[PDB]
Design an enzyme around this catalytic site. Structure first.
Site, mmCIF file in Angstrom:
data_model
loop_
_atom_site.group_PDB
_atom_site.id
_atom_site.type_symbol
_atom_site.label_atom_id
_atom_site.label_comp_id
_atom_site.label_asym_id
_atom_site.label_seq_id
_atom_site.Cartn_x
_atom_site.Cartn_y
_atom_site.Cartn_z
ATOM 1 N N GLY B 104 0.798 -1.200 0.000
ATOM 2 C CA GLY B 104 0.000 0.000 0.000
ATOM 3 C C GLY B 104 0.837 1.258 0.000
ATOM 4 N N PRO B 105 0.190 2.411 -0.142
ATOM 5 C CA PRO B 105 0.909 3.687 -0.089
ATOM 6 C C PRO B 105 1.431 3.954 1.311
ATOM 7 C CG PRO B 105 -1.450 4.053 -0.141
ATOM 8 C CD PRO B 105 -1.250 2.595 -0.381
ATOM 9 N N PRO B 106 2.454 4.802 1.457
ATOM 10 C CA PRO B 106 3.038 5.047 2.788
ATOM 11 C C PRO B 106 2.078 5.802 3.698
ATOM 12 C CG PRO B 106 4.617 5.551 1.071
ATOM 13 C CD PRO B 106 3.299 5.367 0.390
ATOM 14 N N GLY B 107 1.846 5.246 4.888
ATOM 15 C CA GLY B 107 0.979 5.839 5.890
ATOM 16 C C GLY B 107 -0.129 4.917 6.354
ATOM 17 N N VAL B 108 -0.529 3.961 5.514
ATOM 18 C CA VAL B 108 -1.527 2.988 5.925
ATOM 19 C C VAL B 108 -0.923 2.043 6.957
ATOM 20 C CG1 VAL B 108 -2.662 3.170 3.705
ATOM 21 C CG2 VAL B 108 -0.997 1.354 4.082
ATOM 22 N N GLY B 109 -1.791 1.408 7.730
ATOM 23 C CA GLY B 109 -1.320 0.639 8.863
ATOM 24 C C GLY B 109 -0.802 -0.735 8.514
ATOM 25 N N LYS B 110 0.412 -0.823 7.979
ATOM 26 C CA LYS B 110 0.982 -2.121 7.639
ATOM 27 C C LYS B 110 1.748 -2.732 8.810
ATOM 28 C CE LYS B 110 2.363 -0.228 3.505
ATOM 29 N NZ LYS B 110 3.335 0.398 4.422
ATOM 30 N N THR B 111 2.626 -1.942 9.434
ATOM 31 C CA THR B 111 3.366 -2.404 10.603
ATOM 32 C C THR B 111 2.434 -2.624 11.788
ATOM 33 O OG1 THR B 111 5.314 -1.209 9.813
ATOM 34 C CG2 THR B 111 5.290 -1.844 12.129
ATOM 35 N N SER B 427 -5.699 7.859 -19.962
ATOM 36 C CA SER B 427 -6.983 7.899 -19.271
ATOM 37 C C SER B 427 -7.692 9.247 -19.345
ATOM 38 C CB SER B 427 -6.777 7.517 -17.808
ATOM 39 O OG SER B 427 -5.967 8.469 -17.146
ATOM 40 N N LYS B 470 -10.192 8.346 -8.121
ATOM 41 C CA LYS B 470 -10.753 9.347 -9.020
ATOM 42 C C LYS B 470 -12.156 9.748 -8.592
ATOM 43 C CE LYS B 470 -8.037 7.947 -13.005
ATOM 44 N NZ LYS B 470 -8.062 7.561 -14.436
HETATM 45 N N1 ADP Z 1 -6.438 2.157 9.432
HETATM 46 C C1 ADP Z 1 -5.814 2.711 10.496
HETATM 47 N N2 ADP Z 1 -6.440 2.853 11.675
HETATM 48 C C2 ADP Z 1 -5.829 3.398 12.737
HETATM 49 N N3 ADP Z 1 -4.567 3.845 12.724
HETATM 50 C C3 ADP Z 1 -3.823 3.766 11.603
HETATM 51 C C4 ADP Z 1 -4.420 3.179 10.401
HETATM 52 N N4 ADP Z 1 -3.479 3.223 9.443
HETATM 53 C C5 ADP Z 1 -2.376 3.785 9.990
HETATM 54 N N5 ADP Z 1 -2.582 4.109 11.275
HETATM 55 C C6 ADP Z 1 -1.581 4.744 12.153
HETATM 56 O O1 ADP Z 1 -0.601 5.345 11.314
HETATM 57 C C7 ADP Z 1 0.705 4.846 11.580
HETATM 58 C C8 ADP Z 1 1.264 4.217 10.311
HETATM 59 O O2 ADP Z 1 2.484 3.549 10.611
HETATM 60 P P1 ADP Z 1 3.072 2.407 9.643
HETATM 61 O O3 ADP Z 1 1.958 1.438 9.356
HETATM 62 O O4 ADP Z 1 4.341 1.895 10.277
HETATM 63 O O5 ADP Z 1 3.497 3.205 8.311
HETATM 64 P P2 ADP Z 1 4.065 2.470 6.993
HETATM 65 O O6 ADP Z 1 3.135 1.307 6.760
HETATM 66 O O7 ADP Z 1 3.995 3.531 5.926
HETATM 67 O O8 ADP Z 1 5.466 2.066 7.371
HETATM 68 C C9 ADP Z 1 0.581 3.820 12.689
HETATM 69 O O9 ADP Z 1 1.249 4.295 13.858
HETATM 70 C C10 ADP Z 1 -0.898 3.669 12.969
HETATM 71 O O10 ADP Z 1 -1.173 3.880 14.355
HETATM 72 MG MG MG Z 2 6.477 0.023 8.461
#
Ligand code: ADP
Ligand code: MG
Ligand code: ATP
Ligand code: ADP
Ligand code: MG
Lengths: 7, 523, 512, 175
Positions: B104-111, B427, B470
């Site tokens: 996914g794009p950077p910022g979504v909760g992957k870790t 597109s 979009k």
């Molecule tokens: N769907 C979500 N719900 C709640 N918190 C989220 C969600 N996605 C991201 N976050 C928060 O945003 C931060 C994203 O960190 P991280 O997943 O490590 O970034 P990346 O995946 O870009 O390495 C996490 O600390 C998390 O608490």
């Molecule tokens: Mg990470």
């Protein structure tokens, strides 16, 4: 104890 | 006298035999020397390794559901896939298939989904960050021929967990350098290959450590995964966020972990949700909620410093007007709908990796010698789509009411206003055609209609990719009607009904369907 | 013997069964052996580790404001962020979240902020610049050594130039310092020389860098604070208040003989140097002071040396660089755009010549392709509006058009200065002189709009230095006018516009 | 000291004489050393390289085509090639190992086919992924003068199996 140069 | 710890560790064959041998050698030898540091180093690395310590996993999925629904929001397809995986592990008890890959794009909760899978199953969490991995001996280790020799990070993080079955998070499998001394994709292959997990060969330990018990999950921003690794991964593909999804992530998850981090109790700070929407729309351009953590944490910290150096106000409330007092001026702004029906201007839909944006398209047909100029950092595929669209206009020239000599009599210019931003892709083709028709008849384009679609020469509208960002962009910008092609109609069953209830989506098949809807006067 | 020393500091109990363990081992060995030198050394490198004796951190923020302002002039947003960190540090006794990072070009004082924060928080300062017991003898680790040397439990720690730490070679990985930065792995940091877990909580961390080229396990924990380039009034205030006395004390110049005026310093900043910081200014000022000392030893007749804007060619050589000025002496068919760069701002004159010809369009002056696209867009705006501007519309085929920007061999690129080139085209086509007191910035579209630009402050300081009185900015940059000093607002007549008609109404001296 | 593992390995003449010259050189060295650690590392590699170990290969053709038909469907040219090899192999003692190159689209069944050939001919299986191999040191290795010196990755997989006749799956040659 003696130093020794490695490559 | 460490003779009882070898039997106390209950190690397998080669581990016990090399440690017993190592101990005797050390015993004969003299202490305090650097060679006794290497030997004694080898024994106290061979005792931290979890040879038999197993953590009990849990086999219930109702509790796993009600753990995964907390700590996150709205990743229901991803969490659904994870519950399928743990649903399989209650019957097979050791997965021999691929590895869960979170893209996914950077910022979504992957870790954080790594941590919540690790809390949901019952195992211990560990994360091996990548990016600085150039050596293959950074994962497999070095041998013990050098004075300072210490193992690779796989068995060291296995040593700081101390459990035979952890949950590894191979973080950033995409990001690793090109100037690579060995091939770490082969080592990362053999930690993920179940024929080669029974026999893993660390170069420091020089023994046969079993990795056929560890649950691996990895993260990823894209798919620049090396070639031997890509066929061992199962991609779950976390998508981006809407505005109300970021408002509920900040509402239910980001504010209580920043009020608690700055020790703000309930009677001090109240952040209105329109301020959160103003940080989403006006300050940040991320697809995730990391920048919401930055401006929310900075906002709470400024509330703290004001509550110390003020001592008169006891309840700071931050609505959508006070952020300019706190977080400064507005950094960015999103493109929005135009107010009146302009002649040449056509709003298109553009897709970037930080989300979706609108894409203004101006044209100008002035009386000249027939030369067309394309400006706006346009890619070659875009320019081919524009002259394809102009070929559509030249073929349909007499029934659109256009004087057919406009190839020779009128100069045509196509500009897209963000001149420094590069852009490419087919597109926008049926957008361009509409603009050209709108400049060759004087028929203005109604400003509440955005459109997307790849045009062909016989007029048909080919499908495009990524309707979600979009339609979120047209939803954000104040567009009311979106003209998509017909075969992207399938994607309308993956869109939140706030967008469908808000928008008026018309699927089109040919270019006459576009020109009928999108222009004001009938062609 | 040594027991009153190991109980004299009251070390924690684990480290005293270790320390008393090698003490009762020391009772059963020879004193003069080198192994006993390793034993006494291992005792000595634990009774210097700061297990206790914290520094009382300060909680008020007004005296912290002035003790930040006593050594640094104009880092106001950084000082705000440090007082906010001391506010949550005042409430939360142990902040273990992210770590302060100071990103900025070299020359600004991001390293000496470790000193100003160091005596601003009250704690002790240890600086780390990044860029096992045995028979041969071993020193402890660098992270611990700074702590022992300082001898305090709560010492500010700096990770300087992490952009220059991680090279393209085999060196330090990210492991041994993110295990220092993370909150849960700092209750037990077992140093390899001591094999005793030592805490790293309640230890403030500040890391400085010149870019965001930071390793990915470290960028997760570092709040990127940006430090922009200093303006010329700020560089004058930094040279006059903080930089002349340190050169006077490192050169031993008593106050009676050397006078470096303000016009001398502004002559160095404008005429003799081009950087974002104040380092090259200190090479020029140090050269000026040592030439004053040489001119006092080599001539005992005169004693007071007066240095002003005129006699900086007797010293320091001749003027190396120069800046652009308003061509106010006449109003002609050229415009004055605005250019932004890392060193600061620059005026950017734009010239057109429209002779009779076949319609050839020549663009000249090392122009980037986005600029040439903006000239074609601006010329399309002129062709679409040819009748109402008074232009004979056949100029696309009857007049050759040349667009030149004078500083050749200077690469110029960017979407800005589109309305400037549109004004120059309308000017040279209509024969209407652009008034010379007007600088311009903005981005033109085919409909006639004016889109926003970036770096408005340095364009406004370039326009204020150049002698421009009237500045035409886009409408959506009014927001950025909330961070301009009010002398510059008071001297510049700033007109926010949104179309090309508002531009041509103001910028042309005759009505169109 | 370690000659019991040298005569226990049944090495050929050059390898045996060289490893016993290295071990005889090692005894006149003082232990706890750097170069003695180098020599013990080199002997430790030559005691685990297969010199004589050979797997008994399958002579039956009907059972072989039964195996390659039970784990794949309709890869007739390759299965014909393996029956050709197992038909020649029943007439002589040893053959040069056939060097093949399976070229096709993704997902067409080239890696599991190598597993099938391994299980059917009687050979043992190990694969070396050639994707990302960027230098010759992953094939020939480094001299033991160097610090991190290992015998490539061919000899490590020969030692990882422990036989003289494996099936290397040189996977993704074009990568
Ligand atoms: N769907 C979500 N719900 C709640 N918190 C989220 C969600 N996605 C991201 N976050 C928060 O945003 C931060 C994203 O960190 P991280 O997943 O490590 O970034 P990346 O995946 O870009 O390495 C996490 O600390 C998390 O608490
Ligand atoms: Mg990470
Ligand atoms: N003819 C076949 N009969 C039975 N199974 C097959 C056949 N072809 C492919 N498969 C199955 O397809 C799966 C994946 O194929 P495989 O990984 O061998 O593709 P590949 O050719 O190696 O791809 P690539 O060329 O990209 O490496 C295997 O598990 C295999 O069982
Ligand atoms: N605002 C300021 N006030 C006073 N002096 C300053 C200011 N900014 C920079 N300086 C001077 O400029 C020098 C910059 O050096 P330094 O910051 O140590 O190196 P770097 O920029 O590589 O971190 C400092 O010695 C400091 O004296
Ligand atoms: Mg394959």
């Amino acid at each position: 104890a003696a130093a020794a140069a490695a490559a | 006298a460490l003779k009882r710890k070898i039997e106390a560790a209950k190690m397998p064959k080669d581990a016990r035999e090399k440690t017993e041998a190592e101990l005797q050698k050390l015993k004969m030898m003299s202490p305090m020397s650097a060679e006794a540091t290497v030997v004694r180093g080898y024994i106290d690395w061979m005792l931290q390794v979890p040879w038999n310590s197993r953590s009990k996993v849990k086999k219930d999925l109702v509790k796993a559901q009600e753990v995964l629904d907390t700590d996150h929001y709205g990743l229901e397809r991803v969490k659904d896939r994870i519950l399928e995986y743990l649903a399989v592990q209650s019957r097979v008890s050791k997965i021999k298939g691929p590895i869960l890959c979170l893209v996914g794009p950077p910022g979504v909760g992957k870790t954080s989904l790594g941590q919540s899978i690790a809390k949901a199953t019952g195992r211990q969490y560990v994360r091996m960050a990548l990016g600085g991995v150039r050596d293959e001996a950074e994962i497999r280790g070095h041998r013990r021929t050098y004075i300072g020799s210490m193992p690779g990070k796989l068995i060291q993080k296995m040593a700081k967990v101390g459990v035979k079955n952890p949950l590894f998070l191979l973080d950033q499998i995409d990001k690793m350098a090109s100037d690579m001394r060995g091939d770490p994709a082969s080592a990362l292959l053999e930690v993920l290959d179940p024929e080669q997990n029974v026999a893993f060969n660390d170069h420091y330990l020089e023994v046969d450590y079993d990795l056929s018990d560890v649950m691996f999950v990895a993260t990823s921003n894209s798919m620049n995964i090396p070639a031997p690794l890509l066929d061992r991964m199962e991609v779950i593909r976390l998508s981006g966020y809407t505005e109300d999804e970021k408002l509920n992530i900040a509402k239910q998850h980001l504010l209580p972990k920043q009020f608690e981090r700055n020790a703000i109790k309930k009677g001090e700070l109240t952040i209105d949700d329109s301020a959160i929407m103003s940080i989403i729309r006006y300050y940040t351009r991320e697809a995730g909620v990391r920048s919401l953590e930055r401006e929310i944490s900075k906002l709470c910290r400024k509330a703290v410093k004001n509550l110390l150096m003020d001592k008169t106000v006891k309840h700071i409330e931050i609505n959508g007007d006070n952020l300019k007092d706190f977080l400064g001026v507005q950094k960015v702004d999103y493109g929005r709908a135009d107010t009146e029906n302009r002649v040449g201007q056509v709003t298109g839909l553009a897709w970037t990796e930080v989300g979706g944006d609108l894409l203004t398209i101006e044209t100008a047909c002035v009386p000249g010698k027939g030369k067309l100029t394309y400006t706006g950092s346009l890619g070659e595929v875009m320019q081919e789509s524009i002259q394809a669209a102009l070929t559509v206009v030249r073929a349909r020239a007499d029934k659109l009411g256009i004087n057919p000599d406009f190839y020779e009599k009128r100069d045509i210019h196509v500009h897209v206003p963000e001149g420094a931003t590069p852009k490419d892709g087919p597109s926008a083709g049926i957008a361009m055609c509409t603009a050209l028709v709108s400049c060759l008849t004087g028929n203005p384009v109604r400003a509440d209609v955005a459109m997307t679609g790849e045009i062909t020469l016989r007029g048909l509208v080919l499908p495009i990719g990524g309707l979600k960002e979009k339609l979120l962009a047209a939803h954000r910008g104040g567009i009311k009607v979106v003209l998509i092609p017909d075969d992207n109609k399938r994607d309308l069953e993956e869109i939140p009904d706030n967008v469908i209830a808000d928008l008026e989506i018309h699927p089109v098949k040919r270019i006459d369907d576009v020109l009928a809807i999108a222009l004001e006067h009938p062609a």
